């Protein structure tokens, strides 16, 4: 009788340590995407200097 | 002093400017209530039409 | 009951039921009136052909577009369009089905007043709602924030949206879209000698634009390549069977989107409109907007437009910051798809405009209830 | 020797001879460039129209403002403006006449460096002077003390001056003036269905703003009156012969001066800028500034701005002392009138900036000489 969003939240609560794994996922992918962007431009700044 | 004795309040408190402000705001609420009741009657007449 | 989504677009009307992913009735918004002399007796032939019927018999018809630059010009023609999409294409009674409408930003308000009056008097509905098309395009992407460049058939408009709230002052409008590209393509096909003057020929030039045109990544190099060798030349077969061949007109036509001075407009291109729309916003909410360009509209089907968009914005943007052009493949119907998403929620049920609200508030609650 | 007074404002350059009452040469500061193609060979088709010629032939001219937000951005255009105002309007040699000039508060120093270098290297003068616009407006008001709200075309700045001492910390600047009101008036006219997108149309909307707009004394009562009765609607004739009629846009457009949240600015109105300027002064001299609220600039030409301004300050300030608004009828040219007052003084011979001072101390003696 619940909403399907509530079905998603109760499926989410049935997972051991889900939120830390989501944080692990986003920090790994986001920090990797930042590392792709930052270091060639930093090498370009070093080459300019 | 006559207005202080008229409204049954002691004259040591501000019985001159506060009565003017209270009464001015009450007369503005009188005209505003008249205006909103006229608007309510006119909108009810327009909805009935 | 099951709701309806009817994107009443400037060139094509996309109607269908809520909860669905494909719009059931996609048909162009035209009215075809006969101009020659009938000689058959037997009646049968109407005095006005609407939709695909006007497209099929277009060689003897004057075609009138009711919507011009997101503004409904002839209200009788648009009433005929609404009557055709309610009674013939979708075949639903209007007074038993909720129906979601779409409207372009910065419109004249009396256009919204007249649409509200027709949808509550002529095709009176149990409920309806009028909403901004770029918002529904963002809702199709599954994201809450981002900027939508919606380039339809009459209006190309930029809307940035932060946390589901469209920022009103930063929205800009440009009266340059697919009909003007069709008119410019009609103008430049006379260079090769292919003359097109009738309204029926505009559909042929539009089909040429749909099937063969594409956005150049670098315009000057594509000039040099097309003028150098005949590699980008492509041939098209006409309905009478003549074969034309077009070269640079494949990419001189969409370049009016990035250079509006080709058709005499003083205003800047869509990339500059996007950039100046973003600089009209606050600085702190800029971080969502460059990373969430969600393009929409039928004009954005040209298969070089995402890379050109990314190139022009990354030229314009500060270099420290991510540019991401989310161009979904179904972004033509993203207005309709996002309409089905928004119309298939229990949270939307309190947001409807009932007939009772129309009766107490006139046809003017659409300026208040609908943002 | 007659000096020259030439306010090089953001909106209109106002120039004339010193010792006089009215500026002889008032003309807008635009540089017009043709955007189309010339076909008619001969007859002096000059590539960059300046001033009144750019105003008259504006239908084929992209117009550029050299002064944007009180800052000389384009310098070659400003040199063309100075060349037109010296050689064509006044028709005087610069090398035999002193030239007074004006400047905005809190200006960059290199702006003053560049103006000094142009006024001593290109247009050689015997002497010249740079003054603050508010100081000259206070001088034309005939008072040594007072607070000046000068609202031009780009800058609305508040400057309090006590006994000739212009207080530097209490000066503030709000980037909301007449061009922003014109752009907002372009935005809100599209609700009535009138489109003005080109820079040529900006002069037409500016003329609408100059002729018809007025400051509301109470905004909500004017909303109630405008929504109730169509008595305040006023008609205007366009240069092509069409006639528009505008309603609440006569007073929704100057209300941006009191409510900058219309165009999306977090800062409050000019009244709060004036009041926060007043608390930055000493508590002894606040009483004199309340009775000496001087206005200048043409954005104060709306004929309801004084009573509304007095109402706003009297709401803001304590009512124990007197509030008075100094609004002379000629406060449009009060910058020029104060320059004409200051130029013909016997004391002002020893505060002139000579060419010998320029040669000794670079274009930098204006910083240590003037305030
Ligand atoms: N595959 C395509 N390639 C190029 N242009 C297209 C394509 N499909 C549609 N268009 C253009 O888009 C227009 C329809 O856009 P649409 O999304 O219906 O805008 P609106 O909803 O505002 O009418 C058509 O007139 C056509 O010119
Ligand atoms: N009669 C008027 N009514 C309303 N606004 C005016 C009027 N005259 C001028 N303005 C506005 O005020 C400005 C006047 O320019 P001014 O203040 O003299 O120099 P600037 O604004 O260039 O520093 C113009 O930009 C114009 O938009
Ligand atoms: Mg569309
Ligand atoms: Mg000025």
Curated annotation (Swiss-Prot), chain A:
Transmembrane segments: none annotated. Signal peptide: none annotated. Widely expressed. In the kidney, expression is apparent in podocytes and some tubule cells. It comes from the Eukaryota. It is found in: Cytoplasm, Perinuclear region. It is linked to Focal segmental glomerulosclerosis 5: A renal pathology defined by the presence of segmental sclerosis in glomeruli and resulting in proteinuria, reduced glomerular filtration rate and progressive decline in renal function. Renal insufficiency often progresses to end-stage renal disease, a highly morbid state requiring either dialysis therapy or kidney transplantation. Severs actin filaments and accelerates their polymerization and depolymerization. Interacts with actin at the FH2 domain. Interacts with DAAM2. Belongs to the formin homology family. The WH2 domain acts as the DAD (diaphanous autoregulatory) domain and binds to actin monomers. Regulated by autoinhibition due to intramolecular GBD-DAD binding. This is Inverted formin-2. The chain holds residues 697 to 745 of 1249 of the full protein.
From Swiss-Prot, chains C, D:
The lineage of its organism: Eukaryota, Metazoa, Chordata, Craniata, Vertebrata. In vertebrates 3 main groups of actin isoforms, alpha, beta and gamma have been identified. The alpha actins are found in muscle tissues and are a major constituent of the contractile apparatus. The beta and gamma actins coexist in most cell types as components of the cytoskeleton and as mediators of internal cell motility. Residues 106-119, 354-366 are annotated as: Interaction with alpha-actinin. Polymerization of globular actin (G-actin) leads to a structural filament (F-actin) in the form of a two-stranded helix. Each actin can bind to 4 others. Interacts with alpha-actinin. Identified in a complex composed of ACTA1, COBL, GSN and TMSB4X. Interacts with TTID. Interacts (via its C-terminus) with USP25. It is an enzyme of class 3 (hydrolase). It holds the Pfam family Actin. Disulfide bonds: none annotated. The modification Tele-methylhistidine is found at residue 69. This is Actin, alpha skeletal muscle. InterPro entries: Actin, Actin/actin-like_CS, Actin_CS, ATPase_NBD. One of its GO terms (biological process) is positive regulation of gene expression. Its main location: cytoplasm. Actins are highly conserved proteins that are involved in various types of cell motility and are ubiquitously expressed in all eukaryotic cells. The modification N6-methyllysine is found at residue 80. GO terms for molecular function: actin monomer binding; ATP binding; calcium ion binding; calcium-dependent protein binding; cytoskeletal motor activator activity; hydrolase activity; identical protein binding; magnesium ion binding.
